[PDB]
Assembly symmetry: D2
């Protein structure tokens, strides 16, 4: 069964033990940054406070899903407080909303808000035109496999790229 958790599990991974992300920072779950502190103990302290348990740096899938939903809520709130993103989000169906949230997980609300032409196209239901435009971007060149899946989601409005 496909949904936003399974989508972001594919795109960001689901890691139950603390690990270093691509910038060297302690992370867990679905891309959840614990701390920029170089101390593994600091990361474990942040994790234990968040989870309410002495984790030893290892969480369960259900705990990861709790952190993930916290992060989804934060993404949605950033979207709703952003004048470029809110009207697009308001106009989108659940699957395309998941694609927009996916972009926020990757680059943050301000980063997604920068796609001014493509966002306008999405609001206007010009799915393929938006997709063709997004595929020309620096975002796409940097992470083309993920971007292609997210763009297919905008084009089709289905989970087909994740099946």
């Amino acid at each position: 069964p496909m949904n936003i958790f399974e989508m972001l599990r594919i795109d960001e991974g689901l890691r139950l033990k603390i690990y270093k992300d691509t910038e060297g920072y302690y992370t867990i779950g679905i891309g959840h940054l614990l701390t920029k502190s170089p101390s593994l103990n600091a990361a474990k302290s942040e994790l234990d406070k968040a989870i309410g348990r002495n984790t030893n740096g290892v969480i369960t899938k259900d705990e990861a899903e709790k952190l993930f939903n916290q992060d989804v809520d934060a993404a949605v709130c950033g979207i709703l407080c952003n004048a470029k993103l809110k009207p697009v989000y308001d106009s989108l169906d659940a699957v395309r909303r998941a694609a927009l949230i996916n972009m926020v997980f990757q680059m943050g609300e301000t980063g997604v808000a920068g796609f001014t032409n493509s966002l306008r196209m999405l609001q206007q239901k010009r799915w393929d035109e938006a997709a063709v435009n997004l595929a020309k971007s620096r975002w796409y060149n940097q992470t083309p496999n993920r971007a292609k899946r997210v763009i297919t989601t905008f084009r089709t409005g289905t989970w087909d790229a994740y099946k």
Copy 2:
């Protein structure tokens, strides 16, 4: 006279004509991203809507200061909605608040929120300990001149690094 506008003018520059930032994106003023679209016309369209004027891609200092204050307000609001940043911000004086906002301009609220040990030190008024810790960071290594000025601001609570 030193203040947050003059501080960020030194750290991010004050550019009255549209230019490409370090990621190649059209920007103006004090680090204000206009669009990620590769179209200069798109950037000019965003700018003209924001300013209320047909700018030709060139703004006045006062217009730049208006955009800057919009960006400061956005930074402060992100700080106030972040559980790691809000209590620190609430506890800081104006000058150290400017240093925290400066970090948000550079890396965003979620990025600054990652400095969990240093933030705790700031909340506890352990200025030098926070400064020594921040100077060990990847942030510092990447942009050491700016980081050193911001860290001096946290250590001293003065504008001395910008004089």
Copy 3:
């Protein structure tokens, strides 16, 4: 089947035609305020913009549910940006979260944030103690049938008061 839509339908009503709320303001759906303007035309204009349709002041249940979900998202975001509400919300299960959101629909985030002792009790899983305290409140005296249902939801963690 019980859920937050059905809960708030019982507590705030589901009205498909524009009506005046208890303060005389044009409202529709599940307590969704359209405008404080005394003009029915103004209310219809706001509604038509929100729905994307020439409604004549009458919406479908599905349209009402869309507006309702917009309002739920706004409530959750206000909760997450409030230092008194966020840690309680983070700690609660889905059913008790619905009770907290219900209070936000009624009185707003700042209003719910005022229940400082009861909120602490909820965070500590002291359900009955929180419920006994809330039943002593001015909120309860003003709207005792709704408050009793919401308080039962906090006490029991079930939808029993709505069945």
Copy 4:
């Protein structure tokens, strides 16, 4: 010297000792709600945490101004996250911004957002038309002395109603 602190001091009062507001709730400073709990001890506990001092329920003017600025920042952030208020606020000068913030202190962001016709008039710089419309409102009838001062501020763009 007139400014937003002095404006709201006139409209909401400046009270250095805990008092009950018009709804019976413990309040201090410039309309700052401490708690809805009927316990004066609870109110004193909230106050002491906010101030960092054992206050005995009495604060200094400077402490009141700190709480006031926290409340101004919260109002501005609510304005900036509201699709009806943000574009108006972005377009207004400092004095008229103070009038909008004043309304948020009184009735909250969602309450001010309800003035859909008057807000449009303000965005269009139709000051007198907005003022004439606001004076017809339930808000005005309920609190006519305050509303008249705030409306004069919108009409004139000066502090004249507070001199």
